[PDB]
Design an enzyme around this catalytic site. Structure first.
Site, PDB file in Angstrom:
ATOM      1  N   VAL A  12      45.705  44.518  80.926  1.00  0.00           N
ATOM      2  CA  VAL A  12      46.275  43.222  80.586  1.00  0.00           C
ATOM      3  C   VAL A  12      47.719  43.436  80.122  1.00  0.00           C
ATOM      4  O   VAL A  12      48.083  44.545  79.734  1.00  0.00           O
ATOM      5  CB  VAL A  12      45.398  42.517  79.508  1.00  0.00           C
ATOM      6  CG1 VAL A  12      46.158  42.301  78.203  1.00  0.00           C
ATOM      7  CG2 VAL A  12      44.838  41.212  80.045  1.00  0.00           C
ATOM      8  N   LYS A  26      46.457  38.456  82.551  1.00  0.00           N
ATOM      9  CA  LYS A  26      45.797  39.400  83.428  1.00  0.00           C
ATOM     10  C   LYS A  26      46.224  39.111  84.858  1.00  0.00           C
ATOM     11  O   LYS A  26      45.777  38.141  85.465  1.00  0.00           O
ATOM     12  CB  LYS A  26      44.272  39.347  83.284  1.00  0.00           C
ATOM     13  CG  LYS A  26      43.617  40.724  83.431  1.00  0.00           C
ATOM     14  CD  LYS A  26      42.233  40.641  84.047  1.00  0.00           C
ATOM     15  CE  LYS A  26      41.773  42.004  84.542  1.00  0.00           C
ATOM     16  NZ  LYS A  26      41.987  43.056  83.505  1.00  0.00           N
ATOM     17  N   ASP A 110      29.286  41.169  80.045  1.00  0.00           N
ATOM     18  CA  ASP A 110      29.926  42.395  79.589  1.00  0.00           C
ATOM     19  C   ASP A 110      30.463  42.320  78.162  1.00  0.00           C
ATOM     20  O   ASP A 110      31.602  42.712  77.900  1.00  0.00           O
ATOM     21  CB  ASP A 110      31.043  42.782  80.546  1.00  0.00           C
ATOM     22  CG  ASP A 110      31.392  44.261  80.470  1.00  0.00           C
ATOM     23  OD1 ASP A 110      32.500  44.626  80.909  1.00  0.00           O
ATOM     24  OD2 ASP A 110      30.564  45.052  79.966  1.00  0.00           O
TER      25      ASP A 110
END
Ligand SMILES: CN1C(=O)N[C@H](Cc2c[nH]c3c(Cl)cccc23)C1=O
Ligand code: NA
Length: 247
Positions: A12, A26, A110
């Site tokens: 990022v 991003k 995640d």
């Protein structure tokens, strides 16, 4: 709706908007745009917000709010201490963010300390810097926080319980101030071990951690997904505990 931005708006990766200020970026059409509109709906004090999208020629970008102290593991490992009431608060906020996400029908897939960002007052927001929750944008890692049903099974569909398992490991990390499984031989054997029930070494939590958070983390990383609570259930338990003993 969703704010289409241009790259001429910036000076990022950190990014400096000319009218809005510090943002994170991003760098990566009806479909990408549509996905972005869907993600733009995620609006909650404990959730990193999609501020804009850059769709131009030789670059696609997602633009999110900045969080000043970086990720949670970074703050946990800082030379300066992080008190117990504050850790309890961070846990509560993570719980609120996750409940809101599942409430919008979004499964993270995640969750992990890297995806937990922290501001200057040690308030947190949940992020998805790897775009795990995305479909179209992700197309264009460590498994310490991954539910066993996903380990060695990439076709099984992830549920809310998947995120609850990740949450369990995050509780552990919050109290140990580091990554679990430092003694592991190799990733293959580690994966088989966790699939067969191995979990982060609670004895490796040296500083004080209440017994009921140890209990919570053990409940949340249960092998059977249906034995794990939902995030609203967790909140239902944890909030009156936090207030009554921690706040
Ligand atoms: C990737 N980028 C973020 O970190 N926050 C926004 C919104 C967002 C999309 N999916 C998210 C998940 Cl799974 C968690 C938190 C924010 C989000 C975003 O698009
Ligand atoms: Na390893």
């Amino acid at each position: 709706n969703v704010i289409k931005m241009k790259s001429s708006d910036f000076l990022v990766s950190l990014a400096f908007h000319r009218t809005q200020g510090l943002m994170i970026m991003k760098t990566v059409n009806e479909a990408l745009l549509e996905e972005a509109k869907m993600m733009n709906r995620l609006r909650h004090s404990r959730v990193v917000k999609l501020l804009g999208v850059i769709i131009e020629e030789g670059k696609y970008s997602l633009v999110m709010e900045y969080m000043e102290k970086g990720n949670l593991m970074h703050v946990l490992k800082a030379e300066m201490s992080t008190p117990l009431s504050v850790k309890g608060r961070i846990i509560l906020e993570i719980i609120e963010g996750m409940a809101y996400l599942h409430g919008k029908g979004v499964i993270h897939k995640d969750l992990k300390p890297e995806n937990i960002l922290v501001d200057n007052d040690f308030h947190i927001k949940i992020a998805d810097l790897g775009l795990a929750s995305f479909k179209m944008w992700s197309k264009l890692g460590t498994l310490y926080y991954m539910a066993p049903e996903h380990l060695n099974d990439v076709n099984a569909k992830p549920t809310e319980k998947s995120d609850v398992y990740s949450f369990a490991v995050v509780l552990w990390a919050i109290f140990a101030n580091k990554e679990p499984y430092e003694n592991a031989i190799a990733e293959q054997q580690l994966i088989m071990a966790i699939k067969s029930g191995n979990r982060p070494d609670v004895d490796d939590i040296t500083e004080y951690c209440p017994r009921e958070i140890i209990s919570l983390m053990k409940l949340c990383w249960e092998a059977n997904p249906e034995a794990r609570p939902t995030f609203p259930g967790i909140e239902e338990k944890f909030r009156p505990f936090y207030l009554s003993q921690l706040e």
